[PDB]
Amino acid sequence: MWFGEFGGQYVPETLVGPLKELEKAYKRFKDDEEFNRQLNYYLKTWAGRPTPLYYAKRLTEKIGGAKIYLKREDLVHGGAHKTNNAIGQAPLAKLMGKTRLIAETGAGQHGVATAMAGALLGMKVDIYMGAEDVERQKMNVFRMKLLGANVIPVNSGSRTAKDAINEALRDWEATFEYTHYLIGSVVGPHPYPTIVRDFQSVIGREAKAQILEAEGQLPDVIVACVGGGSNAMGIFYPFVNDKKVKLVGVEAGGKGLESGKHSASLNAGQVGVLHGMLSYFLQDEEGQIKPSHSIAPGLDYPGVGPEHAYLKKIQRAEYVTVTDEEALKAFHELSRTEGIIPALESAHAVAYAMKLAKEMSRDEIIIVNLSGRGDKDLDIVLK
Amino acid sequence: MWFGEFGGQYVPETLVGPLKELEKAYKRFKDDEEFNRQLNYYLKTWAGRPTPLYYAKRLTEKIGGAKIYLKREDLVHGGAHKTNNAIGQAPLAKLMGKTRLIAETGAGQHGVATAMAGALLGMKVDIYMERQKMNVFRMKLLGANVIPVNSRTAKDAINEALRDWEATFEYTHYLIGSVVGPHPYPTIVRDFQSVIGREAKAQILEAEGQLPDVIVACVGGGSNAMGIFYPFVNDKKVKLVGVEAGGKGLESGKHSASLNAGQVGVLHGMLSYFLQDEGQIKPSHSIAPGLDYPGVGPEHAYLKKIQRAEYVTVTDEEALKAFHELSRTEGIIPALESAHAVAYAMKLAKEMSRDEIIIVNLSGRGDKDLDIVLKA
Numbered sequence: 001m002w003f004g005e006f007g008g009q010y011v012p013e014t015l016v017g018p019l020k021e022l023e024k025a026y027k028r029f030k031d032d033e034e035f036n037r038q039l040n041y042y043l044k045t046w047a048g049r050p051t052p053l054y055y056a057k058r059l060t061e062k063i064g065g066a067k068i069y070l071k072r073e074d075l076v077h078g079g080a081h082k083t084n085n086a087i088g089q090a091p092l093a094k095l096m097g098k099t100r101l102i103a104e105t106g107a108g109q110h111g112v113a114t115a116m117a118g119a120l121l122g123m124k125v126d127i128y129m130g131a132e133d134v135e136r137q138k139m140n141v142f143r144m145k146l147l148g149a150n151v152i153p154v155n156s157g158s159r160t161a162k163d164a165i166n167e168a169l170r171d172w173e174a175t176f177e178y179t180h181y182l183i184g185s186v187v188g189p190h191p192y193p194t195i196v197r198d199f200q201s202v203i204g205r206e207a208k209a210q211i212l213e214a215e216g217q218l219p220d221v222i223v224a225c226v227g228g229g230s231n232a233m234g235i236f237y238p239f240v241n242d243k244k245v246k247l248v249g250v251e252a253g254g255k256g257l258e259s260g261k262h263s264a265s266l267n268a269g270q271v272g273v274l275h276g277m278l279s280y281f282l283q284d285e286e287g288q289i290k291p292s293h294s295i296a297p298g299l300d301y302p303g304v305g306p307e308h309a310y311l312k313k314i315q316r317a318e319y320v321t322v323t324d325e326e327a328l329k330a331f332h333e334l335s336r337t338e339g340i341i342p343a344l345e346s347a348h349a350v351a352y353a354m355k356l357a358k359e360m361s362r363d364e365i366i367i368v369n370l371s372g373r374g375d376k377d378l379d380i381v382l383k
Numbered sequence: 384m385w386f387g388e389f390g391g392q393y394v395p396e397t398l399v400g401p402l403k404e405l406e407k408a409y410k411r412f413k414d415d416e417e418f419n420r421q422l423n424y425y426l427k428t429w430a431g432r433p434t435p436l437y438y439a440k441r442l443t444e445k446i447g448g449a450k451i452y453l454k455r456e457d458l459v460h461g462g463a464h465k466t467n468n469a470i471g472q473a474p475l476a477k478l479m480g481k482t483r484l485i486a487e488t489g490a491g492q493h494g495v496a497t498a499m500a501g502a503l504l505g506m507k508v509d510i511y512m513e514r515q516k517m518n519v520f521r522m523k524l525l526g527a528n529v530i531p532v533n534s535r536t537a538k539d540a541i542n543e544a545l546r547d548w549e550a551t552f553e554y555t556h557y558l559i560g561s562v563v564g565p566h567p568y569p570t571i572v573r574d575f576q577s578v579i580g581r582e583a584k585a586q587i588l589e590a591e592g593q594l595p596d597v598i599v600a601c602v603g604g605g606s607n608a609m610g611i612f613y614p615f616v617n618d619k620k621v622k623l624v625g626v627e628a629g630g631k632g633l634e635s636g637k638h639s640a641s642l643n644a645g646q647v648g649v650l651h652g653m654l655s656y657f658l659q660d661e662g663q664i665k666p667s668h669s670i671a672p673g674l675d676y677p678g679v680g681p682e683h684a685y686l687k688k689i690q691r692a693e694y695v696t697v698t699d700e701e702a703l704k705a706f707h708e709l710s711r712t713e714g715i716i717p718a719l720e721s722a723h724a725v726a727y728a729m730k731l732a733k734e735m736s737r738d739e740i741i742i743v744n745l746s747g748r749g750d751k752d753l754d755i756v757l758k759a
């Protein structure tokens with residue numbers, strides 16, 4: 001439940017039972033051979049795992065420092081790492097006797113991923129999405145619609161991802177008997193931060209095996225963008241006990257940290273409680289939650305997962321920020337240099353890795369988690 | 384050179400030298416250990432091969448007949464099989480001493496695939512080709528120059544690229560995107576797509592312990608279909624079925640079913656089937672932009688004539704139903720081209736027994752087609 005001070009289960013009493021039953025079922029199935037055979041079978045044949053580890057040779061030699069490798073989550077079915085978690089939880093929900101999935105989404109990749117999983121398993125899917133995000137993400141909304149899910153626009157509060165979560169939590173309170181709330185990042189009340197991390201850890205486990213094959217040694221740094229923190233935990237987690245492996249999380253610096261228009265919860269936020277968890281949140285002078293921003297819509301969440309708050313506290317992971325302008329510059333750089341169009345979220349990690357590689361030596365190694373493909377962001381990059 | 388009477392090399396004398404040098408370079412490098420090492424390394428780490436073979440269980444059980452398996456080329460980097468060919472040809476060109484790739488594009492997936500390969504290999508890329516306007520900006524982002532043409536039609540891309548290549552062949556490779564054009568292009572593209580069928584054979588043997596009863600693939604120019612077909616051609620019991628674009632109906636005249644309703648003739652350096660009016664080349668149509676080409680590859684013309692493969696058609700409407708069906712039933716949004724294959728596999732599956740096995744080549748993902756499906 002806790003990662004030092006952070007985490008917990010800050011929910012109305014009515015959700016304590018449901019959360020206890022999710023925890024029981026997860027403990028019962030996480031190590032069950034059939035559940036794992038089925039999960040791995042879906043990951044292989046449907047999602048297309050393992051994803052490759054790619055050496056960005058031209059980008060490395062152009063910068064002239066450390067080797068930059070890219071963990072290719074952009075090649076997962078759906079175009080993002082979110083699928084790994086969606087197909088982990090959705091069959092668990094089925095085993096618990098649930099017939100409906102609900103979820104929040106901001107960039108729409110988790111919403112799409114939840115819809116894909118629901119379609120495959122034949123479950124009802126309702127996706128809560130902030131009205132401002134629905135207009136912003138018309139295409140992923142259509143993907144969700146074509147996959148048989150209903151997208152419910154949220155007109156509460158600030159009409160974005162935090163508001164979608166509040167509506168989903170409200171729905172789940174009234175529908176938990178037959179509905180699973182498929183949370184899409186390492187956030188929410190226990191056990192969700194742990195469950196989502198566990199279903200994303202496959203990324204790090206593959207990357208470890210793959211870098212050992214390519215180089216014979218663990219990397220010097222792993223770099224991942226951080227919204228709520230699931231792609232980063234996924235690649236970080238299997239290296240946590242490899243002490244010499246540096247872990248860097250990249251948050252959205254937006255228009256700048258001094259601009260007040262960013263999404264860097266760990267960097268500039270303060271401790272608070274929201275959506276069932278005690279963690280870092282961007283909050284105003286008075287004490288309520290602050291409006292976040294990023295050019296990358298998947299980084300627009302004003303909080304971060306408790307496990308990252310923890311890793312930051314014990315100084316196991318370093319957390320940095322990169323701006324809209326730097327992320328956009330990385331999006332173009334990778335596209336022309338390596339022929340890979342990254343998600344704007346992932347471009348933040350690419351951007352920081354480019355800075356760090358220059359400062360590092362030629363025989364050192366960085367793995368960048370390329371969390372998704374950029375197809376969804378073409379209209380945004382045009383601007 | 385030929386596949387039966389079909390194929391060949393009917394071009395101006397000025398292209399005979401360039402094509403001859405391409406043949407020789409391809410012969411030199413096709414089975415070169417190092418060339419294949421590079422190619423396989425890029426196909427693995429960059430393109431994400433192998434792609435999985437997926438058992439569409441919900442779809443299979445709903446229809447109530449043969450097992451439907453999908454070869455997931457939708458998961459290849461770029462979202463389509465066209466990548467397999469682009470990444471095969473581009474290093475060949477570089478080895479030959481070229482610094483520049485040119486290409487045609489219909490649905491933009493080849494245009495993008497070429498741009499992607501060119502970016503990867505640090506080669507200049509100029510492409511000839513609104514309906515797939517997301518792919519047009521993808522190309523720009525990838526560092527390619529798009530040359531819009533002024534017929535102003537997609538077949539005029541294949542026309543314009545040849546004109547350019549006549550002048551620039553000393554340092555320019557014309558990267559053809561399907562199993563079409565003068566020898567050796569239909570062979571080269573087929574060879575580079577055959578990795579699809581080599582994977583599928585090993586995967587279906589792993590999964591079912593036997594070869595499939597039918598392989599179904601959509602057919603535009605015919606490359607994804609040749610890719611999956613070719614390794615099974617010598618397996619007699621495996622039926623091979625190509626699905627052409629039926630458009631608004633065969634009786635409407637607005638289709639791209641070259642093999643089904645076209646006439647034999649010469650175009651773009653090859654003898655094959657084309658849609659013709661007076662014997663003159665005729666415009667095609669399909670809701671699936673990748674199938675919207677009046678001609679077809681000579682190896683399919685050959686396969687049809689010897690009856691090794693059967694060629695059928697699926698209408699725009701049928702393709703649209705299959706698009707929605709696969710999305711809703713299996714959580715896979717297929718390319719509209721690929722949706723023709725799914726639509727035919729669904730009819731065929733119904734007739735067949737529960738023990739029988741169909742592999743559908745899912746040639747692409749449908750992210751490119753969302754606007755088109757929206758308007759419909």
Ligand SMILES: CC/C=C(/N=C/c1c(COP(=O)(O)O)cnc(C)c1O)C(=O)O
Nearest residue numbers: 105106108109110227229230231298372
């Ligand atoms: C809070 C909503 C976040 C979403 N996506 C976040 C995201 C992120 C950031 O999410 P995390 O990995 O959990 O830090 C990174 N990469 C891609 C491709 C993403 O889509 C979504 O709704 O789709």
Ligand code: NA
Nearest residue numbers: 048050431433
């Ligand atoms: Na793969």
Ligand code: NA
Nearest residue numbers: 263265301303
């Ligand atoms: Na955040």
Ligand code: NA
Nearest residue numbers: 639641676678
């Ligand atoms: Na045709």
